[PDB]
Amino acid sequence: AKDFSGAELYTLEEVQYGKFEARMKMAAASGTVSSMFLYQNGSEIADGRPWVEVDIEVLGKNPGSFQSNIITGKAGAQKTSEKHHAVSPAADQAFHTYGLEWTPNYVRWTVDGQEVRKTEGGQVSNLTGTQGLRFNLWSSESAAWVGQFDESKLPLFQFINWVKVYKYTPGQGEGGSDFTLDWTDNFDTFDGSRWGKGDFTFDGNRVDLTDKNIYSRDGMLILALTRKGQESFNGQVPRD
Ligand SMILES: [Ca+2]
Ligand SMILES: [Ca+2]
Ligand SMILES: [Ca+2]
Numbered sequence: 714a715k716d717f718s719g720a721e722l723y724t725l726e727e728v729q730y731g732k733f734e735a736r737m738k739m740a741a742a743s744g745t746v747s748s749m750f751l752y753q754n755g756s757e758i759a760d761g762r763p764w765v766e767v768d769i770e771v772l773g774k775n776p777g778s779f780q781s782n783i784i785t786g787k788a789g790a791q792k793t794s795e796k797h798h799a800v801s802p803a804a805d806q807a808f809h810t811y812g813l814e815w816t817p818n819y820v821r822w823t824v825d826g827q828e829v830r831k832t833e834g835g836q837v838s839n840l841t842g843t844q845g846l847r848f849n850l851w852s853s854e855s856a857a858w859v860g861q862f863d864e865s866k867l868p869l870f871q872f873i874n875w876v877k878v879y880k881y882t883p884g885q886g887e888g889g890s891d892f893t894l895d896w897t898d899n900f901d902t903f904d905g906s907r908w909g910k911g912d913f914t915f916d917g918n919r920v921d922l923t924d925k926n927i928y929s930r931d932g933m934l935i936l937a938l939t940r941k942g943q944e945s946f947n948g949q950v951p952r953d
Contacts, residue, residue, distance in 0.1 A: 718944050719851035719920035720927050720936040721911030722873070727754065727843035730881035732892040734812045735848065736874040738951055739804035740938060744852045744862025745773030747804070747871045747936075749811050751844035757915065759788040765840050767820055769811050773852075774860030777803040779811075781822050781830050785839040794836060798822070798829040808874060808953045815840060816881055816891065848873060849911070850936040851920045862919065868939040870946065874932065874953045875899045903929040 733751065740747040753765035766784040778797050786792035800809060812823035820837055822830040850871045853859045879892035886892045898904060910924035923944070926937040931950040939945070 714941075715914055715919060715921045716941050717852060717867075717920035717938065718923045718926050718941050719849065719918075719938045720924075721847060721849035721851075721913075721922040722927055722934060722936060723752070723754075723847040723909050723911060724845040724878075725907060725909050727845040728878075728880070729843045730816050731895075732812065732814045732877075732879035732881075733846050734810055734877045734879075735846075736808055736810050736876075736953065737848075738806075738808045738872045738953075739771040739776070739779075740850050740869040740871040740936070741771055741773045741776035741803075741805040742863050742866035742869055743774045743860030744856070745771075745850070745869060745938060746853050746859060747771040747773070747850050747869075749813070749846075749848050751813060751815060752847050753842050753844050756784075757788055761787065763787055763839065763841070764791055765842055765844060767813055767815060767840065767844070769813065769822065771800075771804045772859045776805045777801065779804060783820060783832060783836045783840065785836045792836060792839075794832065796830055798824070800824055808872070808951075814892070815844070816883075846876070846878065848936060849922060850926075850938045851918045851922065852938065854917050854919050864940065868937055868943065868946075870938075870948065871936040872951060873900060873934045873936070899932065900929065900934045901932055903927065903934065 751767040756764040768782040814821040928935040
């Protein structure tokens with residue numbers, strides 16, 4: 714297996730459309746990826762099925778920005794639309810509320826309630842089916858994308874204070890809006906009836922995502938990126 718340990722938190726259930734918010738302080742060092750994303754599980758299987766995914770990824774070499782993306786097409790022939798958005802304070806220096814909205818008509822990205830991207834059109838028409846909400850922390854082998862991996866910066870931690878998921882309820886949300894809050898997880902514990910911890914990896918990722926690196930402490934869920942064999946979190950959870 715691999716020489717580093719990362720983590721992936723994922724909802725056990727997938728949904729069709731919705732609004733998803735996560736209050737997070739992201740991880741960043743050259744070479745890392747710290748994310749929030751919607752994912753249709755199995756998209757990675759190259760049997761001809763479609764790929765359905767929407768991303769927020771902080772690329773470690775540039776902590777003051779995040780990359781947005783929609784991945785459609787299919788495995789081995791993806792259609793993407795990478796864009797970048799400034800975040801202030803930098804993503805690894807403060808908590809921000811990251812939002813994703815996905816409806817039949819558009820996908821929208823927000824930071825602290827402010828829109829940073831809204832996409833319509835072809836890829837949106839191909840985000841069919843369901844997607845679960847996921848968060849992961851890893852390191853990409855593409856130095857051009859994330860920077861050379863600086864192992865001396867390990868361990869790194871991504872903190873998730875809370876998550877809110879809203880159902881798509883067109884014209885029936887508060888004040889005629891299109892979403893209605895469905896559930897909130899404040900992360901006082903790891904709720905195993907709601908979430909799973911990933912134990913797998915993929916090509917281009919130099920880490921094994923492992924359940925060893927998801928921690929529950931002081932009201933937050935913590936994802937860690939560590940050298941293999943150094944899986945621990947003995948720091949202080951930041952205040953939000
Ligand atoms: Ca290195
Ligand atoms: Ca909390
Ligand atoms: Ca697992």
